[PDB]
Amino acid sequence: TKVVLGQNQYGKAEVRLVKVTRNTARHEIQDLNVTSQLRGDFEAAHTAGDNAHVVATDTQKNTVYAFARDGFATTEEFLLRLGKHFTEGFDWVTGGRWAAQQFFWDRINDHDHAFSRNKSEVRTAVLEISGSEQAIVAGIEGLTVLKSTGSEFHGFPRDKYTTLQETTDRILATDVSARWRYNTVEVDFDAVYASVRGLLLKAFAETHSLALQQTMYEMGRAVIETHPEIDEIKMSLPNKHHFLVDLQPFGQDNPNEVFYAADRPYGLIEATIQREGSRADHPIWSN
Amino acid sequence: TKVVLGQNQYGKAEVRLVKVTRNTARHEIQDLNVTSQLRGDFEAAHTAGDNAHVVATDTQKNTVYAFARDGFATTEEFLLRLGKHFTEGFDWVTGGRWAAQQFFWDRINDHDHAFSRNKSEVRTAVLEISGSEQAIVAGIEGLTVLKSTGSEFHGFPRDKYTTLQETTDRILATDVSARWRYNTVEVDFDAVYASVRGLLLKAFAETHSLALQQTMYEMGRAVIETHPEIDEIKMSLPNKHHFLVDLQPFGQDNPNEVFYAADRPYGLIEATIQREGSRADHPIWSN
């Protein structure tokens, strides 16, 4: 009967930007995948098709490139500038979501202007503005890790659908996906990102795993305990199964040496590790 | 300071199931990609590696195949059975999230047991249980549509970064990604999915678009006005740009005939259309 326009947002998604810093002969590369979406009073645009309040997505795109010309210290700093510009430059725009993926490059044999892509991980940043408030979530993804031993899984319930054998020695492989929310905008973004990455890797490798859940808990704990500016960290870790192949039919044995790496299905362990007292339902996690 | 385990869930993701119904010579095929995740008291699993409460993801996987043996009328019904099983079968499991993608097959020349995949759209379903509360969201994705005319965009704000020219005739192309939440479990799930799909396609095609936001609004309005069992529908529609190629440098005109279909960037318009007075932010959307 009666229909109502609810939450909404629009903008330009995946604007691929490469910013080269070449004031000196020692070039620097900043490679980003930027997305910009605005929130505010767009009622008439939906109900009547009145574009008076619709800042064209093409315009949002042009702004990204225009702002990049001035350069930026970090990805987060760049998103902060974009968000401030759109929310303050238009009265009907009250907020939005600006996100970016940052791709890393390494110099080829330390060359001044020749690089190769480091595809082992992708850094992420998301800025959300709501009226007078803003929040930033940084993250990492695509970082595949594996422990060839020092992992076990036993003591789990055994119902009539359980066939999994308990083990005290198995491979533990996953793709590290983690996102953490800052409780302040005054952060050394690059330094914290590198720190967190190292803490996650260290926790994963040095923790004698009794369950992926425990390893993940330890990874999140290390971060919260080391960084006061981080209120919570969410992780989504797939258990990429490496099956110990049965070689007995061929007259052999397999002392935890030969594995079949299955694509699907895979276990998916996810959790939020937070600082006691901090909020547990922040809007930035809604996307 | 004090680290605490927040929201969490775990299970088996992407269990590929193909159920063949062959009681008669007229075979039927059900093809699904199922994910099962449990929620409850998993504190000890995370903080101490105590797996007493950890129903193995492998066991969750086994359950999917064992349950499929009995057959299921619809994907939603199948998910409902799985959800009830895990929540009621284990005291420390108070809820969860069970999802699936349904892939369509068509018979080859009406053959009894020979089929070809219809890859033009993927059907989705998600069930979330939280205590005594149950919620189901159905959806459709991967459905690409295009209008060669009957689409315009003008009257938008023009700032120093605006270069886009107004138009009264352009191509409008998008990939229909839609998800709607049911307000009851007693629904003819297959019949409603077929209906919603048709309403979305019909609205996209018949609406003289003055903006993608408007087309989306009309699509959502049609679904809500037609189905009493739906409280809201969310849509994420990319504006896949088809640029009219400038052939004037070659002395040729281009009367809206030759286009370059760019990959990225793309406009991304999203909105929620809801039944007036219905829940504003149902937890199921958080995931």
Added chain:
Amino acid sequence: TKVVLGQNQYGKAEVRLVKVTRNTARHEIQDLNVTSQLRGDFEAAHTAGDNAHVVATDTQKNTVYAFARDGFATTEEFLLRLGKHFTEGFDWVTGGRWAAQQFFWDRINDHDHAFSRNKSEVRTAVLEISGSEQAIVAGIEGLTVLKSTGSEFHGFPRDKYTTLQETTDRILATDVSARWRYNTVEVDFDAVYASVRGLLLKAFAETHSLALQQTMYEMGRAVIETHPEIDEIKMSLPNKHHFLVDLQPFGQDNPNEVFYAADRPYGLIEATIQREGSRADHPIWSN
């Protein structure tokens, strides 16, 4: 010691073109992904960086759009125009390879200018010119098919590494990747493509398969025997494994009903079916 420049080609790959025919209210859509590469004397370009002979890839791209303006009856006709243009327009260009993928669209409820994408298959065309001679290869890909029964596999040899159990009833699922070479350019391209597509599906579905190899042979035979204009057809068929799940651990039998559809690994059966007396190694297959 002495280095020589061997075979080489260059051009613009993946030019996405959408040609809308709108001389009447009944719009038509042609959607292509075009690749153009030239062959000839480019010795100096490689050894000295002298670009006098290098028709820019950007120019080749512009040519694709400029030619699309005039329209084209078929993808093959369009490729033929491009090939002729480049080979005859530049003395140092003696040939090349022009390819295209054609994507299909269906009208939305028979609407005059609103369509939805048919993603169930992709049509391909490849034109290769070498001096005064030219050859065309047409094909289809991405067409997934499945037989729920009427397939068996037994009688294979057994060695110490063999564990496979014979069967007289199994699922036979594959992705139809087929390419055929015409022995003349005077062909009703759209009609033959449609016919070939039909012959492949018919042979796949109606052949009681004793092996994927046998099914494939029958598919190729049907095509060669039906179309005089075709000298050979090459197919690459993966055997997409659908494992009958063992439910006995749960107290249930599985009468060929519940299957696990594994991603990898997969059997890969490939063969060339030819018209007796035709060429055995046409250069167009080298690419």
Added chain:
Amino acid sequence: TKVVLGQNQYGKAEVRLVKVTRNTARHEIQDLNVTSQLRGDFEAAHTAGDNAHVVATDTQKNTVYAFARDGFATTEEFLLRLGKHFTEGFDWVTGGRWAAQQFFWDRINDHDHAFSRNKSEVRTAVLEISGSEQAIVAGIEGLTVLKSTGSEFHGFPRDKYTTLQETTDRILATDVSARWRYNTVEVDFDAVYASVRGLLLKAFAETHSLALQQTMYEMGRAVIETHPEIDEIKMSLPNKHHFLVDLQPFGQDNPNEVFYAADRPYGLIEATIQREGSRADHPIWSN
């Protein structure tokens, strides 16, 4: 006319294998994606569905895992063992094609059994056996490189469809896909792969490029000139366009700093650099 069975091969594709070396506490990891296909007399299998000569694809897969148990020095040596086994183990199998992708892993903080994936490149190997002849092609793929300056493109012909402007400063970015054929199987495979990788990177970075064709020629020449065991190297290099964004409409200049990294289309430059007098068209290139 009569239908004939032409070239054909079959086997198991993409068998994912992970081999852990753990005789000492210092674990090593070998990660491969293996494909096995046999060639020989399979006439009856295709024409009559007689599987007497059909060594099961499942058996081939089992053989990969069984052989993995004994360990292997390099990926190429592993393929050689497999190839010799099938060709020498079955009289009707006269040869085949065995290939693999090798994925790299780095230790986490020099840990004994904890690693992370290096996804910046993928190493490939292809072995083809034809009777007594063993031909091997090694390669590298997925290695993206970029030069921020030291690249120009001018002096090309300006035909009636040429709009590209000459330039003496542009970005040159590509994905290094290279494959080289050894003229002997007695090679230090790991050492040569490392050397070749370094030579390609070096030539790409240090060559003042006047054309991608020139940069490619120099990359290939460096390889052939350095390795006597290599008869030819083939490269397929995309010219991933980084368009210098025009900011003048916004009142700004853009001194080679802000770029739009387009997805498609892209220039595709390919060539074969061979040792003078070597085989012109080795069958292994046909696949």
